[PDB]
């Protein structure tokens, strides 16, 4: 369970990479915020991948893992399309990185992020 809860905190983690490395390619056009960007939507893919390996004698947080993900392979195709019109083309990207925001992924996959972190502790706590 204490491995899970840091698999979990590390997925949180490299959502917000994804996101400010994307927003940092926007506003500066160094590849190197870009880079950042594909190795944290990487890092996302494998920690989602192995964090799928610890929880998979547990249906009901398998079931969980496979919601964040939906909601993680949403956000990432959001932060991909922005990346890719990029900051030569800045009115483009900002429209669509502006349009995204109605879908609130940010916020549902936090909560879907609590979800697993919750029933982890409240499963320790019962074992
Ligand atoms: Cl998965």
């Given at each position: 369970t204490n491995k899970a809860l840091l698999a979990?905190?590390?997925?949180?983690?490299?959502?917000?990479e994804a996101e400010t490395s994307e927003r940092?390619?926007?506003?500066?056009?160094?590849?190197?915020?870009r880079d950042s960007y594909i190795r944290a939507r990487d890092a996302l893919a494998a920690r989602?991948?192995?964090?799928?390996?610890?929880?998979?004698?547990n249906?009901?947080?398998?079931?969980?893992?496979?919601?964040?993900?939906?909601?993680?392979?949403?956000?990432?195709?959001?932060?991909?399309?922005?990346v890719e019109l990029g900051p030569e083309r800045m009115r483009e990207a900002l429209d669509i990185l502006e349009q995204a925001?109605?879908?609130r992924?940010?916020?549902r996959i936090?909560?879907?992020?609590?979800?697993?972190?919750?029933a982890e502790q409240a499963l320790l706590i019962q074992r």
């Amino acid at each position: 369970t204490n491995k899970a809860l840091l698999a979990i905190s590390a997925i949180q983690q490299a959502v917000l990479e994804a996101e400010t490395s994307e927003r940092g390619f926007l506003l500066t056009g160094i590849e190197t915020y870009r880079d950042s960007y594909i190795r944290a939507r990487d890092a996302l893919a494998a920690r989602l991948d192995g964090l799928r390996a610890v929880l998979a004698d547990n249906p009901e947080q398998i079931a969980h893992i496979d919601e964040l993900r939906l909601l993680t392979d949403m956000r990432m195709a959001q932060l991909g399309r922005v990346v890719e019109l990029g900051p030569e083309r800045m009115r483009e990207a900002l429209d669509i990185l502006e349009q995204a925001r109605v879908d609130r992924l940010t916020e549902r996959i936090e909560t879907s992020l609590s979800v697993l972190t919750r029933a982890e502790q409240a499963l320790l706590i019962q074992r």
